[PDB]
Design a protein around this motif. Structure first.
Motif, mmCIF file in Angstrom:
data_model
loop_
_atom_site.group_PDB
_atom_site.id
_atom_site.type_symbol
_atom_site.label_atom_id
_atom_site.label_comp_id
_atom_site.label_asym_id
_atom_site.label_seq_id
_atom_site.Cartn_x
_atom_site.Cartn_y
_atom_site.Cartn_z
ATOM 1 N N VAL A 281 0.853 -1.183 0.000
ATOM 2 C CA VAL A 281 0.000 0.000 0.000
ATOM 3 C C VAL A 281 0.886 1.228 0.000
ATOM 4 N N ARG A 282 0.336 2.337 -0.480
ATOM 5 C CA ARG A 282 1.030 3.615 -0.479
ATOM 6 C C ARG A 282 0.426 4.537 0.570
ATOM 7 N N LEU A 283 1.293 5.253 1.272
ATOM 8 C CA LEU A 283 0.889 6.245 2.252
ATOM 9 C C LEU A 283 1.352 7.617 1.772
ATOM 10 N N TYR A 284 0.411 8.547 1.633
ATOM 11 C CA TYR A 284 0.728 9.926 1.255
ATOM 12 C C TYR A 284 0.462 10.808 2.444
ATOM 13 N N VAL A 285 1.451 11.602 2.819
ATOM 14 C CA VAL A 285 1.252 12.435 3.977
ATOM 15 C C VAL A 285 1.527 13.901 3.658
ATOM 16 N N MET A 315 5.285 13.763 1.892
ATOM 17 C CA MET A 315 6.008 12.626 1.340
ATOM 18 C C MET A 315 5.063 11.459 1.094
ATOM 19 N N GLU A 316 5.528 10.489 0.316
ATOM 20 C CA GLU A 316 4.810 9.245 0.168
ATOM 21 C C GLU A 316 5.768 8.100 0.456
ATOM 22 N N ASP A 342 11.787 9.511 5.162
ATOM 23 C CA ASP A 342 11.619 9.628 3.713
ATOM 24 C C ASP A 342 11.144 8.301 3.117
ATOM 25 N N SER A 343 11.009 8.264 1.796
ATOM 26 C CA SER A 343 10.384 7.134 1.128
ATOM 27 C C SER A 343 11.280 5.905 1.017
ATOM 28 N N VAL A 361 9.000 -0.863 10.624
ATOM 29 C CA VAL A 361 8.582 -1.507 9.388
ATOM 30 C C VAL A 361 9.344 -0.904 8.207
ATOM 31 N N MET A 362 9.784 -1.765 7.303
ATOM 32 C CA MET A 362 10.580 -1.334 6.173
ATOM 33 C C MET A 362 9.743 -0.683 5.101
ATOM 34 N N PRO A 363 10.393 0.155 4.319
ATOM 35 C CA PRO A 363 9.700 0.655 3.145
ATOM 36 C C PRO A 363 9.731 -0.391 2.033
#
Lengths: 366, 366
Positions: A281-285, A315-316, A342-343, A361-363
């Motif tokens: 999943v992608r997280l946009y903040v 960031m995402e 950061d991403s 948790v890893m990116p």
């Protein structure tokens, strides 16, 4: 050997000592429990050779010394199957063990007490006591992050670390990491051991959170936990465990706070349309706003938008949503904090109110 | 196609119509639900080709006619995962179905409504209505005696029989038999059909015992049950079912009565030391006394003695204790009656207070 005990003084002991057992051990005696009557004490022992559980029950009724082993499952089922408050009379007679209660009679086959596996004696090198509830919290907070059947055998277990006056647990599968620390009011040497996964679960299940404090003894190759009338001993895992200090993100300059339930339910829905294998999943903040997106090989898509507290730069970042859900489920706090950088860097997650427990948790590139 | 419905008006319908489905049907459209908006009604349909479940929900909010199919699991998980009281807005857009609720948005892939399997129309030959609770009891009383995957396919299901003004269910696996009868206040033709096991379970799970009466229609090859806004249809099983009248013992001249719980617990303990594959126990009966014995290939032995009400001649008889426990568990009465004849004949078991349900267990040589 002979004793008579009340059903309810026998059930929990039987359940505890059966813990390390399996339905059908290749070596048959390992499917049996060792029973020993000595002085005014009945001792019960179950083992799988890697760990052993012992329970002692005071004998207030007439008894006679001696030992034998009996099938754990059958003997437990018999006792549990008897009516509440039943008095259970046991006698060894030849190579049968006789069990009598009310108008019920059972004859169980035995195997010699002399055949029962005896775990070698060892010396305690580090010792401490703490409340059961504390140990329980330390294990609950991290246990889900342990590896399962990884080739890296040292990850199939939990690090127990003493430092200063803190006891600390660490679990990781090489993808995500959990650490939890509690002060226990004793000066300890700095020491680390790896307890095997099955041992961690057994220890966890022996703790009811009650008034009996837990006494822990660690040797060079074993760990022992004593609580009330139960004594659990496990062998340790060899190998060098990762250093959680090296995994924690350095000076995360981005901070998100949100309601734990609201956030969990958003990730859970988005997960529905994530890749079933990789779960990306992608997280946009951005300022006080959060967007979560998920898509899958069928080109289905989910989007969740959430009002949050967020200060830093936009960031995402991508990650495995199951790992995030595991964390949110384990937290059991009202508010959650996430610390980001950061991403291409990990995320650190904690209960907003306590730093006792931290999760990394890893990116993931999506 | 477009509609907006409150989450709670959608959940139970979704759950019901997903019943006949499996996780991964070979034919993919069978993993989908048919959605149809016509007039002021949303219809949902799930099928596995042998049976189908249909649910209708009134549309009180604006809507537009049309049809598509969507993945059942994903669509249900989305709806269930949304907050309580959520309004769920659905629009078909190209070959995607859009779902919007609050700050959540989902895009699901579809398959043409025109591709959805349409079960052939058929004619009702026998019809009746009864309370849901009655149908539920009829099924619950007998369902555990159905065969599973017997080569005798006609036993993997339940007989539904109409006679006089009674509806009767019969289930048997060729070893034990259950029959239950209820008067339903309508004159019926004498008729028998076999409903497949999966259909029996589906029908049972569609009944909540509520105020909506169940309307049943039986055709030459199908059965339909209509309750409230749900319509269930199943194909029937071909073949001739055994005649329960032929299986009931003739004039049992021996009658035992005992507390159901006490009797169940005695058999359950004795079972512990019975043969794991054949489960044989012996019953000894004499005036107002009952003895149950069990032994196994390890020469372990259980004996249970019980005060009962028993009038006839002394006798002993063997049987599979799992069959007897199934019966005692299903009865849910305080007192049980057993009607016996001799050691080579079946036993009939019933709630001591009602003859609505009867159970037959064949004897076994031990």
């Amino acid at each position: 050997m002979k004793f008579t005990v009340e059903r309810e003084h026998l059930l929990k002991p039987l359940q505890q000592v059966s813990g390390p057992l399996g339905g059908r051990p290749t070596l048959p005696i390992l499917g049996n429990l060792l029973l020993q009557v000595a002085d005014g004490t009945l001792s019960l022992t179950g083992t799988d050779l890697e760990m052993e559980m012992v329970a002692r029950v005071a004998l207030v009724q007439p008894h006679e010394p001696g030992a034998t082993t009996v099938p754990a499952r059958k003997f437990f089922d018999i006792c549990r199957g008897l009516p509440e408050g039943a008095e259970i009379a046991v006698q060894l007679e030849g190579e049968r063990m006789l069990v009598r209660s009310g108008c019920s009679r059972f004859s169980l086959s035995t195997l010699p007490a002399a055949d029962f596996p005896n775990l070698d004696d060892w010396q305690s090198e580090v010792e401490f006591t703490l409340p059961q509830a504390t140990m329980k919290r330390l294990i609950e907070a991290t246990q889900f992050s342990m590896a399962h059947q990884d080739v890296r055998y040292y990850l199939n277990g939990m690090l127990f670390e003493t430092e200063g006056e803190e006891l600390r647990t660490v679990a990781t599968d090489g993808h995500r990491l959990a650490v939890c620390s509690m002060p226990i009011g004793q000066s300890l040497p700095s020491h680390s051991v790896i307890v095997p996964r099955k041992g961690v679960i057994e220890l966890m299940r022996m703790l009811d959170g009650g008034d009996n404090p837990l006494r822990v003894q660690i040797g060079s190759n074993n760990i022992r936990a004593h609580v009330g009338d139960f004594i659990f001993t496990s062998k340790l895992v060899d190998g060098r465990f990762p250093d959680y200090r090296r995994v924690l993100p350095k000076n995360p300059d981005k901070h998100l706070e949100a309601g734990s339930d609201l956030l969990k339910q958003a990730f859970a829905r988005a997960a529905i349309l994530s890749n079933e294998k990789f779960r990306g999943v992608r997280l946009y903040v951005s300022e006080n706003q959060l967007k979560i997106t998920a898509n899958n090989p069928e080109q289905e898509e989910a989007e969740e938008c959430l009002d949050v507290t967020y200060s830093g730069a936009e960031m995402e970042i991508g990650f495995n949503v199951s790992y995030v859900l595991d964390v949110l489920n384990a937290l059991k706090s009202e508010n959650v904090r996430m610390m980001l950088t950061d991403s291409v860097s990990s995320v650190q997650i904690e209960d907003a109110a306590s730093q006792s427990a931290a999760y990394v948790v890893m990116p993931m590139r999506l």
